[PDB]
Subunit: 197 residues, 2 copies
């Protein structure tokens, strides 16, 4: 149970983040000021600055939240599914509504502040994927999970999984409406991966 | 004429690496890098926004040695085989080892490293497209726009990077690991 007072602040925070994304997509980053984001979220600028030091920080949580929900659905997928299945299922269950994703991903390239946020997410996603995968193979055993998450095989598989969605996203953002199918196809390369070696 | 700049810039990067390795990043300011390189701090910030950026050109030299070897591989060879040839030549140290190892500690440096690896992908797509083109610049252009190639280049790049990370982590060239990781592209539809 988190307090109603914290739940309301956290909701306000995410409303600011969404309003930021919604402005950046409509009108770009350059023309958008912290005070327009505040106005769009229906809050005073002081409220804006309670949560975010800059407008780039306001939108930064969306990148993270989408990566972290994907990672989570990879872990929580039903146990019997194979890793490609868990991965691909999690993609479908978490990363699908597009044009709002497009410009955001394109901002991760053109803005220096968001280039760093995007790098941080990608790395962070790669690491959580290592952890989720180790949890799917560990059979409840912490010592096994630790050994697996140390493994270059899992680090590599996670980079590949990460790269599967990232390349689909980036290349799509820089023709075909579904970056999805491309991401899903990409992930299929992990079918039959050798987890030991 | 620009050769002198690229030279100053390589010298700054080598100075940085020497200090980072020998005393760590925290003890090293952009200005100590300057002095070690014999340049003024204004000169330093003309090339590098931050001290961690000053090590990019060292990572870049290794990465582009690999992209180059892919380009220069016998033109008969298959892309997968070209990648194997490039890995073989490239990977077949301790400055590299520790520089990469330092990134484990520092997010700012890890960012610079990750960034260099990611630029490499663009070089790879271009290299791979040129081979497959068999000639036509416009074949090569069209091929370079294809997702399948973009994904293959990311996977090859990861194959080497994660190998290199694990190697740098280790006491044993990363060749072993990279090839093993590359085997994931066996049977890929290059198209």
């Amino acid at each position: 149970m988190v307090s109603l007072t914290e739940r309301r602040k956290a909701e306000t925070r995410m409303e600011i983040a969404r309003a930021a994304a919604r402005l950046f997509v409509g009108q770009g980053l350059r023309a958008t000021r912290a005070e327009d984001i505040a106005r769009a979220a229906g809050v005073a600028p002081r409220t804006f600055y309670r949560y975010f030091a800059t407008k780039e920080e306001a939108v930064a949580p969306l990148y993270a939240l989408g990566a972290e929900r994907w990672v989570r659905a990879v872990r929580e997928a039903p146990a019997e599914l194979s890793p490609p299945e868990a991965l691909e299922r999690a993609v479908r269950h978490t990363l699908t509504p597009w044009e709002w994703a497009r410009t955001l991903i394109r901002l991760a390239e053109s803005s220096p502040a968001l280039r760093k946020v995007w790098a941080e997410v990608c790395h962070s996603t790669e690491r959580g994927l290592v952890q989720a995968l180790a949890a799917r193979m560990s059979g409840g055993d912490d010592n096994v999970a630790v050994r697996l998450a140390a493994s270059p095989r899992l680090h590599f598989a996670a980079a590949v999984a990460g790269a599967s969605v990232r390349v689909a996203a980036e290349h799509w953002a820089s023709g075909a409406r579904s970056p999805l199918e491309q991401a899903l196809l990409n992930l299929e390369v992990l079918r039959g991966f050798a987890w030991e070696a």
